Amino acid sequence: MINYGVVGVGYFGAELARFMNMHDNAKITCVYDPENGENIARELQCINMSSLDALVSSKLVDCVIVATPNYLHKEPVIKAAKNKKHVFCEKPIALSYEDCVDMVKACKEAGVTFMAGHIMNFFNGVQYARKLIKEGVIGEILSCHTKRNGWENKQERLSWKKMKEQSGGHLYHHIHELDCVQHLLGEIPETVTMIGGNLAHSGPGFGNEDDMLFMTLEFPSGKLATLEWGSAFNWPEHYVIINGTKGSIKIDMQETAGSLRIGGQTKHFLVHETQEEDDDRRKGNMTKTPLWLASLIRKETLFLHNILCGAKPEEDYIDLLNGEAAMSAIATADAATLSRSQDRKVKISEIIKHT
Amino acid sequence: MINYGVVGVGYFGAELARFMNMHDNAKITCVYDPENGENIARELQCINMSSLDALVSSKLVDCVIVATPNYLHKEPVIKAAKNKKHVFCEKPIALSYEDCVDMVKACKEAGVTFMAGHIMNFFNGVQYARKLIKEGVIGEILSCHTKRNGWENKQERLSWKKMKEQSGGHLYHHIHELDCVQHLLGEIPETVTMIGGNLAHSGPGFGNEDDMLFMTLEFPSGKLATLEWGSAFNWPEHYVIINGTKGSIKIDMQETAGSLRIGGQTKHFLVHETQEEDDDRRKGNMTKTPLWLASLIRKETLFLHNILCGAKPEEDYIDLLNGEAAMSAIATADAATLSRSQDRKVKISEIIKHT
Numbered sequence: 001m002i003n004y005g006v007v008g009v010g011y012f013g014a015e016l017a018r019f020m021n022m023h024d025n026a027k028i029t030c031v032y033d034p035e036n037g038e039n040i041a042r043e044l045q046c047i048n049m050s051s052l053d054a055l056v057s058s059k060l061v062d063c064v065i066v067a068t069p070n071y072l073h074k075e076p077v078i079k080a081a082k083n084k085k086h087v088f089c090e091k092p093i094a095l096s097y098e099d100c101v102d103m104v105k106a107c108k109e110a111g112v113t114f115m116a117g118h119i120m121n122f123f124n125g126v127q128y129a130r131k132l133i134k135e136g137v138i139g140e141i142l143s144c145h146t147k148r149n150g151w152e153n154k155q156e157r158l159s160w161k162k163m164k165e166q167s168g169g170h171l172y173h174h175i176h177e178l179d180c181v182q183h184l185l186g187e188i189p190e191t192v193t194m195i196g197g198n199l200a201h202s203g204p205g206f207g208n209e210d211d212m213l214f215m216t217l218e219f220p221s222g223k224l225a226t227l228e229w230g231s232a233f234n235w236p237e238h239y240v241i242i243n244g245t246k247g248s249i250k251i252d253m254q255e256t257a258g259s260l261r262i263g264g265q266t267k268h269f270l271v272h273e274t275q276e277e278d279d280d281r282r283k284g285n286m287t288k289t290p291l292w293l294a295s296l297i298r299k300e301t302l303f304l305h306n307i308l309c310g311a312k313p314e315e316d317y318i319d320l321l322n323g324e325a326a327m328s329a330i331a332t333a334d335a336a337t338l339s340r341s342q343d344r345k346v347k348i349s350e351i352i353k354h355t
Numbered sequence: 356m357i358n359y360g361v362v363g364v365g366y367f368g369a370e371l372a373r374f375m376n377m378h379d380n381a382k383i384t385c386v387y388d389p390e391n392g393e394n395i396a397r398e399l400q401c402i403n404m405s406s407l408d409a410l411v412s413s414k415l416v417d418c419v420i421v422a423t424p425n426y427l428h429k430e431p432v433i434k435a436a437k438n439k440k441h442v443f444c445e446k447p448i449a450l451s452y453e454d455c456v457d458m459v460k461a462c463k464e465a466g467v468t469f470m471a472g473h474i475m476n477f478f479n480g481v482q483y484a485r486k487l488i489k490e491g492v493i494g495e496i497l498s499c500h501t502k503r504n505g506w507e508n509k510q511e512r513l514s515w516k517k518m519k520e521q522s523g524g525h526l527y528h529h530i531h532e533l534d535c536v537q538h539l540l541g542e543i544p545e546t547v548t549m550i551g552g553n554l555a556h557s558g559p560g561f562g563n564e565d566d567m568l569f570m571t572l573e574f575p576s577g578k579l580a581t582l583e584w585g586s587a588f589n590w591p592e593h594y595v596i597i598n599g600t601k602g603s604i605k606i607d608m609q610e611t612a613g614s615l616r617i618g619g620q621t622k623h624f625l626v627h628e629t630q631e632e633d634d635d636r637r638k639g640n641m642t643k644t645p646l647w648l649a650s651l652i653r654k655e656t657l658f659l660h661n662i663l664c665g666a667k668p669e670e671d672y673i674d675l676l677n678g679e680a681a682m683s684a685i686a687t688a689d690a691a692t693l694s695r696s697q698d699r700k701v702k703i704s705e706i707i708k709h710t
């Protein structure tokens with residue numbers, strides 16, 4: 001029923017392909033990947049296409065899954081749209097707002113579905129927190145806060161992930177937390193500030209990205225947010241906190257657990273699908289796709305496949321299909337990048353209104 | 356040997372008096388406080404003076420202890436210096452850099468001691484962290500981070516503490532954490548940004564201060580810091596974290612404990628003088644002067660008294676006597692206040708060059 005071609009079958013694209021193939025009436029018919037396509041095509045018993053054009057124009061393809069490096073997402077999406085193929089694109093959708101808007105527009109004009117692969121929206125704990133927030137259990141929302149802070153040792157080989165021009169750095173490569181804040185609040189920030197530096201990953205054998213980033217967001221409703229990322233933190237933390245007038249929620253990914261705190265009493269909830277998934281994630285942080293992420297890939301590919309088969313998306317995920325989550329995440333990231341580069345606070349209008 | 360007059364004997368000034376009277380050759384001879392001076396002077400068996408001038412000009416006074424509301428510190432210090440009296444002043448020293456400089460200059464010109472009451476420098480765990488940092492055990496320092504975040508309910512009577520013009524809000528009233536970052540790094544920031552809002556403490560019966568503040572500091576050495584405060588947080592945290600290349604330190608005041616994390620392993624140390632003091636502080640946070648603070652008042656008053664009796668100050672505390680801790684804390688606070696008021700990042704030069 002739905003045939004898929006995968007552009008980029010490295011670590012994550014190969015997993016997307018394996019999990020998609022598990023769904024009834026879904027089939028990976030081909031891949032395009034100069035370095036890894038031969039091996040993956042043999043594993044999947046599909047065709048290793050000799051060029052991007054051969055894949056996106058193939059009659060064997062109904063939907064193109066894009067899982068190339070972050071700076072290489074645009075051409076596969078634009079060419080898929082030109083060939084009237086549906087598109088799933090991994091995060092970050094692109095490394096500039098102009099590129100992201102061009103991608104959304106191309107799919108809109110071609111009349112094809114375009115899904116942004118913002119997988120954190122599918123976390124059990126994120127869905128649940130959103131419902132608690134919406135129902136009013138923590139009152140009016142006042143602020144959100146994220147951290148994604150750890151220590152990365154020098155690596156034997158330097159990969160594209162550490163090069164700002166290829167990955168976008170922590171902000172774009174780990175854009176999940178920023179998209180999550182905007183998803184939970186349902187607003188885009190009017191003013192964006194970001195400070196950062198390369199404090200311990202500068203010199204031979206290292207990339208050129210900042211290894212600490214400290215962002216502050218101000219929203220038109222008056223709500224506020226802070227977001228931190230980096231790879232130079234010997235005090236590790238990884239969380240989203242939502243503060244309301246009646247209580248607060250923490251989605252802790254490091255010491256994996258959700259907490260709902262009301263009247264100084266705390267109730268536990270799951271981040272992932274089961275306590276086993278949360279416990280495994282926590283054990284691994286203390287200590288090659290982990291269980292929690294495998295389950296999410298299965299769920300996200302199933303969502304995509306069901307949409308292409310005609311299902312109506314639940315309201316939680318509509319912004320993944322209309323371009324709004326992608327454009328809003330990249331817009332704020334672009335504003336933060338400008339703020340860091342130009343040593344100033346940035347109005348989101350500078351990004352959204354530039355052209 | 357040393358006679359003290361206390362201007363402002365409310366909660367904290369009365370405690371300063373009681374603890375100072377415990378030291379050999381120290382005596383509180385008088386107080387000035389229209390509302391509470393009668394009661395406290397009876398308790399302390401001393402004179403309740405009828406005016407500030409009568410206290411600062413009294414032959415019964417060698418040193419004036421200033422513990423009035425935050426906006427009422429300047430005149431007692433200026434007049435003490437005019438009368439050649441030594442001065443101890445509670446934090447925040449003043450609510451503007453101009454006032455702080457005037458106070459430091461007046462005492463210098465009069466040849467009297469001026470001590471800034473930045474009591475957090477006396478915490479056992481702060482002293483210990485300074486020694487760990489200096490010896491090199493966490494490597495090169497990269498960043499610092501503070502939070503002082505809790506929930507304050509609507510109070511029966513609205514006090515000066517909640518009025519920005521009287522307390523200076525969280526930043527000045529709880530300036531300890533900012534002074535601590537500057538003390539631990541031994542540097543002042545080049546650029547200061549602060550965002551904030553009054554998210555849940557606006558309207559009849561409430562003050563006019565922001566109830567959330569989010570500050571970012573950039574130091575010319577490349578070091579970075581974030582600092583948060585507020586009274587609208589239903590996820591409470593209170594800590595200082597120092598991140599270095601070899602390890603990190605957390606001084607957690609809420610779940611009261613010091614942590615030194617190196618090579619993935621954490622070693623505990625005390626925040627306060629004894630495990631009893633840390634245990635009791637932690638137990639009280641789950642739920643009038645607590646043990647940890649009583650010990651600090653005893654220690655800080657003993658330090659002042661010993662200095663006035665001729666002792667050489669420990670290197671850790673010299674900046675409480677040469678004006679530097681007071682001026683540097685207030686300069687950064689003024690820069691942050693300007694950043695919040697004018698919606699922009701502020702260079703410290705804008706503040707400190709204005710003399």
Ligand SMILES: NC(=O)c1ccc[n+]([C@@H]2O[C@H](COP(=O)([O-])OP(=O)(O)OC[C@H]3O[C@@H](n4cnc5c(N)ncnc54)[C@H](O)[C@@H]3O)[C@@H](O)[C@H]2O)c1
Nearest residue numbers: 008009010011012013032033035036067068070090091119
């Ligand atoms: N949503 C998630 O949880 C998640 C997790 C990991 C990675 N990702 C995303 O997946 C994408 C790929 O990341 P990864 O970890 O698999 O990286 P990877 O380096 O393991 O794989 C990238 C693949 O792209 C191939 N490639 C390079 N240039 C190509 C080109 N012009 N055309 C076709 N293929 C090309 C490479 O040969 C390689 O196989 C990124 O966008 C990344 O952010 C998402």
Ligand SMILES: NC(=O)c1ccc[n+]([C@@H]2O[C@H](COP(=O)([O-])OP(=O)(O)OC[C@H]3O[C@@H](n4cnc5c(N)ncnc54)[C@H](O)[C@@H]3O)[C@@H](O)[C@H]2O)c1
Nearest residue numbers: 363364365366367368387388390391422423425445446474
């Ligand atoms: N270092 C610390 O740990 C710590 C702790 C608490 C308070 N403080 C500081 O101590 C100072 C006082 O705070 P507090 O908690 O005692 O407040 P408080 O409101 O309990 O006491 C203030 C006192 O000042 C009196 N006063 C008002 N105007 C006066 C005036 N013109 N002249 C003389 N007295 C006047 C008031 O009558 C009252 O007794 C503040 O600067 C505050 O920031 C420091």
